[PDB]
Design a protein around this ligand. Structure first.
Ligand SMILES: *[C@@H]1O[C@H](CO)[C@@H](O[C@@H]2O[C@H](CO)[C@@H](O)[C@H](O)[C@H]2NC(C)=O)[C@H](O)[C@H]1NC(C)=O
Ligand SMILES: *[C@@H]1O[C@H](CO)[C@@H](O[C@@H]2O[C@H](CO)[C@@H](O)[C@H](O)[C@H]2NC(C)=O)[C@H](O)[C@H]1NC(C)=O
Lengths: 49, 49
């Protein structure tokens, strides 16, 4: 009983470590079709839809 | 009489006031683990199958 509380206690922080990094974002924005914002090319950084 | 597992709550005077069957349903299989009668919302860990 004490072992599974230890590994699931480790496993629960691996969710907390990922949410404290990526999930700082309140809202989902769309992918812009514009990709030269003044000649700054951005197809490699944006997802290719 | 059958050999199952019960959890018992004793008062200030050693009187059994309430009891829980640990083999009735999964909700009461949970209360025997955490040692409480009123259990908060979430996933808790129980015995494996
Ligand atoms: C951003 O740079 C990329 C480099 O891959 C350009 O993509 C290529 O553009 C040429 C000519 O336009 C095409 O022949 C290729 O097929 C493109 N490759 C891919 C993978 O799409 C892209 O045109 C540039 N975009 C802007 C806005 O400057
Ligand atoms: C445990 O037993 C004691 C008796 O020794 C109870 O205390 C008495 O309770 C009655 C009724 O509530 C009161 O009128 C008395 O004044 C109490 N006496 C003392 C010395 O406290 C107590 O209530 C019992 N507790 C439980 C949880 O059953």
């Amino acid at each position: 009983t004490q072992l599974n509380r230890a590994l699931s206690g480790i496993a629960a922080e691996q969710d907390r470590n990922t949410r404290e990094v990526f999930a700082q974002v309140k809202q989902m924005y769309k992918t812009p079709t514009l990709k030269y914002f003044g000649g700054f090319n951005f197809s490699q950084i944006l997802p290719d839809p | 009489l059958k050999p199952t597992t019960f959890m018992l709550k004793y008062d200030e005077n050693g009187t059994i006031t309430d009891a829980v069957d640990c083999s009735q349903n999964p909700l009461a299989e949970l209360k025997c683990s955490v040692k409480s009668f009123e259990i908060d919302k979430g996933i808790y860990q129980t015995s494996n199958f």
